[PDB]
Ligand binder design. Structure first.
Ligand SMILES: [Zn+2]
Lengths: 372, 213
């Protein structure tokens, strides 16, 4: 993909491909509340990295116009304010406050840089993507089961990870403190770099963890021990030894040297650990530290956060912020994601179709809940 | 009762609604002094012993009996209700006083609630009880279903079980909940009272209350 072809592709994309229809169905929420869509904030980034925010619109048509007119490189979605963002110059200080916003999550591979071997920095491969996969199953399960949230939309970021938008009625009204509390409820990976062991578990395991573990178990072997091979060598398995008591470093060091592959070595660890309990949950702390999701609280903490809009375009990859089927998550492939260059081709002859269907399926169940 | 005082114009329980009553300045002023000593007693016992001890349970029970706090326990109820709303005028003047007044009133409810029957607590199944037993023991008698949002401090530290948006909390932990939401409404009321005061502040009849804090 060539990012210089970008500004032309946008015009065509914004004019004949962007699903404004389904888009408006979302942000207006059946028009049950007035000025809901009209008070929504957006922000655009144009050429030469010129940034502007506090942008709002009257309706779907008003949106369709200014967008293809402006042709932005980045589009972020903000919160629902007390007034119109583009009228913020009339409102006096102290009355312009964010009042409602969907609950959101931003997951980034950059936060796993200390526990992946396949890629580095912003580079990614199919061997690591299972991290994002496991994270979704862990999170999506909790929100549905523990929090009873019924309307959950996950979206690929365009490159390094995935976003989630929760649009349940009761959710959009949640305070910042509650938002922060759930992050703590979901977060287990605590520490920066000074801390090598970022997970410590008590003797008694909270179910949310237990259920999350049982998910990781199903992915661990092929991801951690095969694709990543975290016990390939000493340089690699010492990092593990940093996560355990010193009293067993030597014992495991030998078994690792006597072993041939990571699977054998991981099996050894389990036996030594199990024997160590009889004489705690060292096995699970390690799986978690390597597979459990890391969360930047800031993105979900603030109600006034501008987050990249779905169906937006990544200025470098050209990839689309496409919806994802939770039912067919394991089969998802971020490399098979339609590029803007690819679907503009199809229009002048799209591959975007199957993903929009999923977004509508989301909208359909959203109406029924709003109704019944 | 020559001197009179309009509360309505001036304005175990959470002390939510003001008292609409006319009372004597002597009752008013004395009732303040009465509750002040009480709070100062709580502060001394809180330093002396530890809450839960029988001596603490025995001593505070005595001072409460001493300070007069069915219809048998009604006269103190009116005393406790009104006395509190007066002190709101005193200890709203500063964060230290607010915190002080709060902290003592906080420690107060604990005891008042410590000596409370389980039956009345609920007012202010058995198969589903045993069905979710394991899932709760591993997480963290009666258990109540709260919207998770109201149980922030609990689930944000994984000290309770969640399911379908609702927390399942014991009676041991539900104390700090009511204790804290109360702490908010009170500190909120104090903050409000701190706005209400500088119109009545100059009143001589209120001078001894605003000074001998
Ligand atoms: Zn990779």
């Amino acid at each position: 993909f060539d990012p210089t072809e970008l500004p032309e592709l946008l015009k065509l994309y914004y004019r004949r491909l962007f699903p404004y229809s389904q888009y408006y169905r979302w942000l207006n929420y059946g028009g049950v509340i007035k000025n809901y869509f009209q008070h929504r904030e957006f922000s655009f980034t144009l050429k030469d990295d010129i940034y502007i925010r506090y942008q709002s619109f009257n309706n779907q048509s008003d949106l369709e116009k200014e967008m293809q007119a402006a042709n932005p490189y980045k589009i972020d979605i903000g919160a629902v304010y007390s007034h119109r963002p583009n009228q913020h110059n009339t409102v006096k200080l102290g009355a312009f406050q964010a009042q409602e916003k969907e609950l959101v999550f931003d997951i980034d591979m950059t936060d796993y840089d200390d526990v992946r071997r396949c890629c580095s920095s912003a580079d990614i491969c199919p061997k690591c993507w299972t991290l994002m996969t496991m994270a979704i199953r862990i999170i999506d399960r909790a929100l549905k089961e523990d929090f009873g949230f019924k309307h959950r939309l996950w979206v690929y970021s365009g490159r390094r990870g995935v976003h989630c938008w929760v649009c349940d009625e009761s959710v959009r009204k949640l305070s910042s403190a509650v938002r922060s509390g759930i992050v703590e409820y979901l977060s287990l990976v605590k520490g920066g770099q000074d801390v090598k062991k970022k997970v410590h578990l008590s003797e008694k395991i909270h179910p949310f963890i237990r259920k999350s573990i049982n998910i990781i178990k199903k992915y661990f072997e092929e991801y951690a021990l095969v694709n990543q091979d975290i016990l390939e060598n000493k340089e690699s398995w010492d990092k593990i030894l940093a996560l355990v008591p010193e009293t067993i470093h030597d014992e495991l060091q030998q078994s690792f040297q006597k072993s041939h592959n990571s699977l054998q070595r991981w099996e050894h660890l389990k036996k030594v650990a199990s024997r160590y309990q009889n004489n705690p949950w060292l096995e699970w702390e390690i799986m978690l530290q390597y597979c459990f999701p890391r969360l930047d609280i800031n993105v979900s903490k603030g109600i006034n956060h501008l987050l990249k809009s779905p169906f937006s375009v990544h200025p470098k990859t050209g990839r689309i912020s496409v919806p994802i089927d939770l039912q067919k998550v394991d089969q998802f492939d971020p490399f098979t994601v339609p590029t803007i260059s690819f679907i503009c081709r199809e229009l002048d002859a799209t591959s975007l179709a199957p993903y929009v269907k999923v977004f509508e399926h989301f909208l359909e169940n959203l109406d029924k809940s709003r109704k019944g | 009762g020559y001197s009179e005082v309009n509360l309505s114009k001036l304005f175990l329980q959470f002390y939510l609604q003001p008292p609409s009553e006319n009372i004597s300045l002597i009752e008013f002023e004395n009732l303040a002094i009465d509750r002040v000593k009480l709070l100062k007693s709580v502060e001394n016992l809180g330093v002396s012993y530890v809450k839960g001890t029988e001596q603490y349970q025995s001593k505070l029970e005595s001072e409460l009996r001493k300070l007069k706090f069915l219809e048998d326990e009604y006269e103190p109820r009116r005393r406790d209700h009104i006395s509190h709303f007066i002190l709101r005028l005193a200890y709203c003047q500063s964060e230290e006083l607010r915190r002080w007044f709060i902290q003592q009133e906080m420690d107060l409810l604990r005891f008042r609630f410590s000596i409370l029957p389980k039956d009345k607590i609920q007012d202010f199944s058995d198969e589903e009880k045993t069905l979710r037993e394991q899932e709760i023991v591993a997480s963290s008698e009666s258990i109540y279903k709260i919207p998770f949002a109201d149980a922030l401090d609990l689930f944000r530290g994984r000290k309770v079980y969640l399911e379908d948006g609702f927390a399942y909390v014991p009676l041991k932990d539900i104390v700090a909940i009511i204790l804290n939401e109360f702490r908010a409404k009170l500190s909120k009321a104090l903050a409000l009272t701190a706005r209400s005061l500088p119109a009545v502040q100059s009143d001589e009849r209120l001078q001894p209350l605003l000074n001998h804090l």
